[PDB]
Amino acid sequence: MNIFEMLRIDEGLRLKIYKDTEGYYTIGIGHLLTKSPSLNAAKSELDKAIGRNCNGVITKDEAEKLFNQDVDAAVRGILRNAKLKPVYDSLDAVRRCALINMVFQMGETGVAGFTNSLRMLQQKRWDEAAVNLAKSRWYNQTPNRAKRVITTFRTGTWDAYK
Template sequence: MTDALIDQLKRHEGLVLHAYTDHLGFWTIGYGRLIDERRGGGLSAQEAELLLCNDVQRVTAAVERRLPWVRGLSEPRRQALCNMAFQMGVAGLLGFRNMLSAMQKGRFDLAAREALDSRWAKQTPTRAEEVAGMIRDG
């Protein structure tokens, strides 16, 4: 693959950093990457893994930036908060004020109960039970 070809494709395709429909109505991302399965598009498992790793780094940094005290928590408890932020965004995580306050005070049983007393837990009960267990047991 030559740099010239890459430069040419960047110019011709343009960069779009979200999913969009191309001129034929098919879902596309990035530099004209077809992801619409109706036309055989998609991602490889390796590409999905790369996206996941990038997202985990981004979410972890955002959680630690907004809640610097989480650096003092055990790894499973930090993972629990990042898991929640990955699912609902950091803003969604910050809405769990009672849970976060309890965690900051080291009251992990209460924090786990607060996590489970939420619409999030009702919507994703299996995930919520696992995450609450990580909060409780550390």
């Protein structure tokens, strides 16, 4: 298991514009297109993103390309973030995957907001951090995915995904 297979399980793949769990226009492997209510504003961003007239639809390769950019951008945002970088650097390889997953889903800013949990992970207090991570809108809104991520931080293995 790697970051790609992990995210592909949590986000799935859809080749047609769809609405995410928040109701935002998305496509591919969790690639947010826009928070705007308009399907046309979504079709627009989509074509801008791919470089062709897609008319709301893309190919597998196009989805995988967006996915490769988004993972890279997620890592690069963590590395550039003063609050995140030190956490990331302190973590083992599996756990790093768990942080990247949160970042991909909720953005740098959002994760950077879990001050207490971040401190606990840095300190390697596993069980405590799993408990604090669960007290969040994130966990209440997408509980099966949050549990998977949280188990990953708790144990440091891929069990939740196997």
